[PDB]
RNA sequence: GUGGCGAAGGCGGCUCUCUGGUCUGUAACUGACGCUGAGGCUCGAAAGCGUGGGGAGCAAACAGGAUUAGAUACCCUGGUAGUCCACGCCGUAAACGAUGAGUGCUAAGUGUUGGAGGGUUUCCGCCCUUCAGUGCUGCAGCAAACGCAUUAAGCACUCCGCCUGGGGAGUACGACCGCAAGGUUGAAACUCAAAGGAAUUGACGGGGGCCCGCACAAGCGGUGGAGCAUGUGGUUUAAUUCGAAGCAACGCGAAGAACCUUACCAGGUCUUGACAUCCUUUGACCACUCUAGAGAUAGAGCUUUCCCUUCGGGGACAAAGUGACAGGUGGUGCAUGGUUGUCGUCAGCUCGUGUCGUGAGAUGUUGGGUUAAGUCCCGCAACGAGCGCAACCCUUAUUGUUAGUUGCCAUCAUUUAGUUGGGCACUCUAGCGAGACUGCCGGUGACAAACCGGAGGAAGGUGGGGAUGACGUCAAAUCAUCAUGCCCCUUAUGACCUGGGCUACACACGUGCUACAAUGGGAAGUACAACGAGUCGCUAGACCGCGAGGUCAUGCAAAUCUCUUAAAGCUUCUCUCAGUUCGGAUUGCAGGCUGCAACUCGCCUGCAUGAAGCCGGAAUCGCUAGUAAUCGCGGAUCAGCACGCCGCGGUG
């Protein structure tokens, strides 16, 4: 605001796997505020990873996660009439904001006949260093150690 | 228009209804029973000076009471004139009438009293600047904590109008318990209409 | 370099030649030789003129491109005189410090340019004194205020130039000067009652600074694309009644257009009158039936029939007379009252006693900090006060006590069951009280106000939300809620009736609803609320109909009965990425309900048909937490008629 920063919006963590990460995912597949829709289909989809090729859905998640966030972003500024782009450092939660942000977004594309069905199949294709999820962090980092250029003063 | 009536602020916190019966399933005809009266009884008020009317009601008896600052002047000589009120209230209402006269202390006090009074003025070719003036000066001399007054329309009969008034003491307005008056009289004198409008602080 | 030099105009790379003035010390000399100066002469920025050279860059005039309503301008590409040198002419500038020259006298403080003396002495870098320039601050005194102030605009003497309300006008005429352009000198006739200087309070600025706010930024869902509902413009019409027009008009007045409402239009009708008072004859008026008529109305039938009596009156009322008169949603919101919108729930608007100012006026109310706050602290020629802010009012979050029916059922029997015996424990209902105050504990900070953290508690820093809207701004809105000054109509702009618009459709704009599907569509089963409404009203139950509904009947004027088993939700079984088992516009046929009557022009039901639409450019909107998003329920208005409006709760 203008008066100065503001809280942190404290969340409960999840019952079930006791995680504040699965709760966040859970806020963010949810549409409407049809939440029980959302949880079961999160639970259907770590059922799907465990049983096909797993070892736990809170490895391979976090694993996922880690290798989707981003570490380096612009921000598009303006000065007196000429608008560039300079990169900035990244503070820890909107890492994780942007990393949940491009999985759901880009498991929602897929094109198969179920949410789980692509959420799974998504989070593992993201736990092995593929998938679009990836590559637009890819993109990203490029964007950025690049258009330092006109960054290198701002 | 940005104030609220200040007597319509405080009905049902300080003060009271000036209508006090409970009825169900015969409220309408009860509702323009009483604007009838009230609409009538301002034949005698046109000289008498009455202020408030209380209008209580029974099983078919309609129990009336009416303030005034001239208790004799309205009730006749030996009691021929509160005969005559009671034998046509009952032509109206067809029931039974029973008025029951008060009579008010200390009248320049009083929202509706002083406003008509200093608008009865105007009618006569008046100067607005003195007879607000002396006005609050002959309210605040009864003892009074806060008067306002204001006079607005056409004045001194002349063309595009325009609106004045002068305070003496404090008047608050935003106070809940403030127990305040008001009232809002017309008058012309050959122009148009004027509007007068007068609040009374009285402590609480 | 607020450095240097020159009488001014002016003078900035370097070397040489010719030359003017100033400053300082000394004390050889002359002995008042001085100051000012009408007329006269000399010099005098830039532009301009003449003769002959020179000509890179820049640039009047001019050409071409743009911009605008136009652009003989500003902006871009070019470009001639001129700007440069020698010699002549011109003689003017805001040629300014808008301040003539000479001389003496009158507090202080501080910089810098060029010298001279004394001390300490590497003083050659430091201290003190003293001349002449050049700046800043400041006293007496001066000034109408601004201000000036040993560089006077102070106190005084000498000499020169010039002024006497604003226009006409530096004009005309004469005269001198100049190649010219022009310069110097310099009126009157007539016309106005002001024109000016300096400062004061407001309002404005395509002036500046500080702050705040869903104002941007970070986000989530939309509008703009498609179909439909609705308002507005436009066009059309016999009429498409009137009002609202950026934010602050456009699901607005209208919280209910088939007739009524209804002002508008076409036909059929009346004139003291649909509605009020008076005065007289007088006085009790009706309603009902039958023919004609679309009705309005007219013509006939039982008759409107003394309710006070002393014999002498008064209330209701039809007609007539009878004219005073009535009647107007006709005009003027720029003649008004009253009632609203918006800045904006932003934080402002004034007074008394003092002090300041020649005076209008100022101060307070400015400054630092803090605050949602002209809310508080500190400082300060101010010290206090009033309306505004906050508090007092309402609702929601916790509980004690009083009271247990129509509410409730924990310890008991009983049935279909809180039902019936029992009880008022619990929930609940509603009167009266408690509880939140930076009130304690730690740190920051001028120890101050205030901010950050903790304890306890249901709740913590105006706990959450409402009501409450200052002085004022927009000649903002409304003569159509109602009143009302002036104007207008009166066998019609008044009044009665039937039928028709207000719903017309090549289109354009706003506000909404339903979707474009799998986080979905269809079939069966199982759950969980709150606010409200009800007497000719809300309808239990049983039966008939696929359905909307219908019949017989039952309780309730209500914590008792009913409206009312909420929908999203959960569990199974399907369907498989398609213009489709998505979507539900449009059309055909058959019904139901209200109403005297649903063609223009109502809502609902069933079978049949099955459009556009596969997430929507420029641009633009709402929102900071039980909020956004999503899902249903109730009622005002109302025979009937809601995607609109006002409320309520569920998931979140």
Redesign the pocket.
Known sequence: ???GP?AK?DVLPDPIYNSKLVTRLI?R?????????????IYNSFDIIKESTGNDPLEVFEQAMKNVMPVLEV??RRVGGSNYQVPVEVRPE?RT??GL?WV?NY??LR?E???????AKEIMDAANNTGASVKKREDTHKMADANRAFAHYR | ?????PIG?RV??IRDWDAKWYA??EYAEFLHEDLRIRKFIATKLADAAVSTIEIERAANRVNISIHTAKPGMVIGKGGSEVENLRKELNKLTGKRVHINIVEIKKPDLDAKLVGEGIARQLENRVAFRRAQKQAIQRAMRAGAK?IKT?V???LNGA??????GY?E??????????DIDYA?E?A?T????????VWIYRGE
């Open positions: 605001p203008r008066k503001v919006r806020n597949v949810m549409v409407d505020g049809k939440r029980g829709i959302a949880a079961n289909i921000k598009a909107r904001t942007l942000r759901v498991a929602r094109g006949h179920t949410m789980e069905e692509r959420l | 228009g940005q104030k609220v009536h602020m049902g916190i169900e399933k806060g204001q607005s329309g056409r063309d595009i109008a325009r609106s004045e305070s003491g404090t008047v608050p307005l935003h106070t809940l318990r403030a809002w017309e012309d050959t122009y148009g209409k004027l509007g007068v409008k």
